[PDB]
Amino acid sequence: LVQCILDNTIHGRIDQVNQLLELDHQKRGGARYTALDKWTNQLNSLNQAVVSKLA
Amino acid sequence: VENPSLDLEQYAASYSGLMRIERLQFIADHCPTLRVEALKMALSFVQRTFNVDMYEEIHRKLSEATALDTAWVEATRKKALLKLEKLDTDLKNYKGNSIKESIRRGHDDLGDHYLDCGDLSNALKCYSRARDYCTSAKHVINMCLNVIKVSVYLQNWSHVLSYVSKAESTPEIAEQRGERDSQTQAILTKLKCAAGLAELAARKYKQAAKCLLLASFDHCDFPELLSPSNVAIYGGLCALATFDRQELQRNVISSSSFKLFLELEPQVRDIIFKFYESKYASCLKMLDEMKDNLLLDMYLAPHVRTLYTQIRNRALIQYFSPYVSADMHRMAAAFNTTVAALEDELTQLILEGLISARVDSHSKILYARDVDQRSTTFEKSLLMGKEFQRRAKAMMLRAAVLRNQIHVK
Amino acid sequence: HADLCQLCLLAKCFKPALPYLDVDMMDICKENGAYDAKHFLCYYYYGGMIYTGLKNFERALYFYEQAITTPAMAVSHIMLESYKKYILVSLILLGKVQQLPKYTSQIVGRFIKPLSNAYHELAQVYSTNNPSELRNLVNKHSETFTRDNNMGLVKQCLSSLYKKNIQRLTKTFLTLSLQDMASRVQLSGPQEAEKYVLHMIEDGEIFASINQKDGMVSFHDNPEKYNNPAMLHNIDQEMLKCIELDERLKAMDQEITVNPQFVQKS
């Protein structure tokens, strides 16, 4: 399982304390959040650009 | 205490020029209970190649740190001066002869004399003078290789990089995509090895591994720049420390050309194979065992320790790659350390963001934290908005004070 | 405004000046050309001191920064004291000295900095996260802080170093022993660490719980899911502030457009 996960063949993780394999049936449409993060970063950069022009 | 892996006779006979002299000097400088043996072999075996000045330097350092048969050394010095003057006169005669072959042979003898004499300033002056005289690509190649060698001897890597870049960019971007692979042109492996040594010595391990892994055993039969054993050592250590799993797999284990280098030094091959197959107790134990030999090296020792830590850190990260909850006791056993030291190391790794995890010191379990993308996006946006409002309300006040032309006189 | 702030500072009555410090200044009365830059500098300095007295370190830092970034060509004692207190407040509220805005006078920023070297080295040793060295250096320049009357802020920096170390402990640990925490952040005692963490949770600066059965502290770094009407109201208030800011900007823009000198120069 470790070898297969390291090879990106198996999308999951291992509970060593419980002796489990939890698969990765997750990662829904969160591209909206990444888009919002990029918007926030661009907005911060534009803030520093506009505010510091002259005054 | 006992190790039959070192074939001293073959190792000594494999080297030519000043390389072995520097090698024995470097090992004997900081080796315990072996300096006397190295000095004995240096005094008894290597008497040629004009060993006079460094003998006096060794005498001076052993005397202050802890008559004579001067006729022979003076005669040899005067003979060298007379030979240099005769070669200069012959070079002037060749210049007056207006023959390209004559001047080329004169330059060849001058380069050979500079190689066997050790003088470098006049060599640099002659190279600067002759750089403007280029007619054929092959001669430029030989002179570039010679200047690369003298820059390596001078330990000046900027010139090495500049000449390498010039050589690569001269023939229409390295012959476009690439010609038929090396059949008998061993020059490309030599220049790649020189560039790898230069980049490794410049605290750039990743590029050194990238441009050193592209070597062929059939074309690495020049034991005057970098021996196959330490070439394999460098190509294994740098790749283990800097390459990720995918490119390490596709460039070391999958590479069949590097297999010969790996079997030449079985320790590095075993290290890489054990690291790749999630084995760290044996891998780190063998790394520690080989560290003593690695420190006695010349071109790797100052860069060994950091590399080692990098390797360990990589292992650490890999050990937690397939886990969302891991046992600290098993992790410590796999990394040959106590639970407290492992906890401290993982705390340091988490602090710098290399590992996204949290340590539970009650049950001694390393859990994996999952960043909530929604919550972190919301908090980052709110913080950005607050910063925007503060910046804008400061800018408005600045505009107000500049409109009033308010300033301190 | 400067005189009111000075009177509130000298009389130790900071509450009356609060409504006249919470609002953001836009445009300055000319006072027939008798409004000196000293009034501006001292008003912002006294507002910063009033806010530091009331533990409002964010607005105090804003006031100190506004006082510092006044254009100048000489050295002012108000500006230097504002620089020192700004460094201290940035070390208290944040873990580092906040970078000054780019639109500051390039000449006044080369002479004031060497004068306030003790505070800069205080920040330098603060960034090492070692309370012992911080205390040693505080004792080394105790005279400078006592003469400038910055004592009390230095002790606040000393306590904020411990608080920041405890907060950083949560960036790595889910659960930690009292003895381990005390040894890591150098409080020399599980009871002192427990009291520190209890006060930190009480003020809301940290999310943690204490289990006295095992003498353990567990950090629950899952405060909010951003899915409740309270966050809706918070975002509404932020949006209202931004909208009023934009309305003020548009009003200023229209005023500058209607000005007769404009367009003629363009």
B326, burial (CB in 10 Å: exposed 0-12, middle 13-18, buried 19+): buried
Give the C-alpha distances (Å, rounded to integers) separating B319 from A16, A21, B340. Answer: 12, 16, 17
What radius of gyration do chain C's Cα atoms show? Answer: 23
Residues of chain A contacting residue C102, judged by C-beta atoms under 8 Å apart: 52
The answer to whether B332 and B338 are in contact (CB under 8 A) is: yes
How far is B215 from C231, CA to CA, in rounded Å? 61
How far is B156 from B241, CA to CA, in rounded Å? 25
Tokens coding B258: 């590097």
Nearest-by-CA chain C residue for B377: C226
Other CB atoms within a 10 A radius of the CB of residue C141 amount to 16
Tokens coding C186: 């150098």
Residues of chain C contacting residue A52, judged by C-beta atoms under 8 Å apart: 101-103
Residues of chain A with a following break (C to N over 2.5 Å):
none
| Residue B391 backbone dihedrals phi, psi, to 5 degrees | -65, -40
CA B30 to chain centre: 20
Q: What is the DSSP string of B210-273?
A: HHHSS--GGG---TTT--HHHHHHHHHHHHHHH--HHHHIIIIIS-SHHHHHHHHSHHHHHHHH
Residue that has been written with the tokens 């190279």 in this structure:
B127
Q: Return the axis-axis angle of helices B257-264 and B266-276, rounded to nearest 10°.
A: 120
Tokens coding C243: 């909208």
- Dihedral, CA of residue C96, residue C102, residue C103 and residue C105, to nearest 10: 80
Other CB atoms within a 10 A radius of the CB of residue A36 amount to 16
Residue that has been written with the tokens 């560290």 in this structure:
B291
The answer to whether B205 and B242 are in contact (CB under 8 A) is: yes
Strands C216-219 and C173-177, bridge-based pairing = antiparallel
What's the per-residue H, E or C state across C23-79? CCCCCCCCCCCCCCHHHHHHHHHHHHHHHHHCCCHHHHHHHHHHHHCCCECCCCHHH
Q: Determine the residue among C102, C104, C238, C256 to mutate to test chain A binding: the one whose Cβ has the most chain A Cβ atoms within 10 Å.
A: C102
Q: Determine the residue among B358, B378, B388, B406 to mutate to test chain A binding: the one whose Cβ has the most chain A Cβ atoms within 10 Å.
A: B388
Q: What is the DSSP string of B265-322?
A: SHHHHHHHHHHHTT--HHHHHHHHHHHHHHHT-SSSGGGHHHHHHHHHHHHHHHHHTT
Tokens coding B355: 């590992």
Coil, strand or helix: which one is C219? Answer: strand
Chains that touch C (3 or more CB pairs under 8 A): A, B
Give the C-alpha distances (Å, rounded to integers) separating B297 from B26, B54, B227. Answer: 8, 20, 12
Closest CA to B153 of B191, B118, B203: B118
How far is B327 from C72, CA to CA, in rounded Å? 61
Chain A residues contacting C via beta carbons under 8 Å:
52, 54-55
Coil, strand or helix: which one is B359? Answer: strand
- Stretch 361-400 of chain B: residues touching chain C, C-beta under 8 Å: 361-363, 367, 372, 374-375, 378, 382, 385-386, 388-390, 392-394, 396-400
Interface check A46 vs B, CB under 8 A: no
Tokens coding B235: 């190509």
CB-CB under 8 Å, C71 with B408: yes
The answer to whether C80 and C111 are in contact (CB under 8 A) is: no
Give the C-alpha distances (Å, rounded to integers) separating B1 from B4, B39, B293. Answer: 10, 20, 12
The answer to whether A13 and B322 are in contact (CB under 8 A) is: yes
The answer to whether C88 and C57 are in contact (CB under 8 A) is: no
How far is B220 from B389, CA to CA, in rounded Å? 65
Strand partners, A23: A12
Counted residue by residue, chain C has a size of 266
The alpha-helical segments, DSSP class H, found in chain C are 2-10, 37-53, 57-68, 77-93, 108-115, 117-126, 131-140, 142-147, 153-169, 178-185, 190-202, 229-258, 261-264
Interface check C102 vs A, CB under 8 A: yes
The answer to whether B209 and B192 are in contact (CB under 8 A) is: no
The answer to whether C80 and C116 are in contact (CB under 8 A) is: yes
Give the C-alpha distances (Å, rounded to integers) separating A51 from B387, C40, C104. Answer: 12, 21, 13
How far is C82 from C69, CA to CA, in rounded Å? 10
Exposure of C212 in the CB half-sphere (CA atoms within 13 A) = 4
Counted residue by residue, chain A has a size of 55
How far is B322 from B33, CA to CA, in rounded Å? 46
CB-CB under 8 Å, A54 with C101: no
| Residue B178 backbone dihedrals phi, psi, to 5 degrees | 145, 135
CA A25 to chain centre: 16
Coil, strand or helix: which one is C101? Answer: coil
The method recorded for this entry reads: cryo-EM
Interface check C27 vs A, CB under 8 A: no
How far is B195 from B191, CA to CA, in rounded Å? 6
C214 vs B350, B362, B374: nearest CB: B362
Interface check A55 vs B, CB under 8 A: yes
B375, burial (CB in 10 Å: exposed 0-12, middle 13-18, buried 19+): middle
Q: Return the axis-axis angle of helices C117-126 and C108-115, rounded to nearest 10°.
A: 70
The answer to whether B113 and B126 are in contact (CB under 8 A) is: no
Query: Which amino acid belongs to residue B211?
Result: C
CB-CB under 8 Å, B380 with A47: no
Residue that has been written with the tokens 């659960």 in this structure:
C175
- Stretch 181-240 of chain C: residues touching chain B, C-beta under 8 Å: 214, 216, 224-226, 231, 234-235, 238
The alpha-helical segments, DSSP class H, found in B118-154 are 121-130, 137-154
Closest CA to C38 of C82, C7, C8: C82
- Output DSSP code: residue C174: E
Coil, strand or helix: which one is B152? Answer: helix
Residues of chain B with a following break (C to N over 2.5 Å):
66
Helix (H) or strand (E) holding B201: helix B187-201
Strand partners, B105: none
Q: What is the DSSP string of A12-52?
A: EEEETTTTEEEE-----STHHHHHHHHHHHHHHHHHHHHHT
CB-CB under 8 Å, B373 with A34: yes
- Dihedral, CA of residue C241, residue C244, residue C249 and residue C251, to nearest 10: -170
How far is B110 from B49, CA to CA, in rounded Å? 17
Residues of chain A contacting residue C103, judged by C-beta atoms under 8 Å apart: 52, 54-55
Q: Return the axis-axis angle of helices C37-53 and C2-10, rounded to nearest 10°.
A: 40
Closest CA to B148 of B135, B136, B158, B138: B158
CB-CB under 8 Å, C103 with A55: yes
The answer to whether B331 and B342 are in contact (CB under 8 A) is: yes
Query: Which amino acid belongs to residue B359?
Result: V
Query: Which amino acid belongs to residue C199?
Result: H
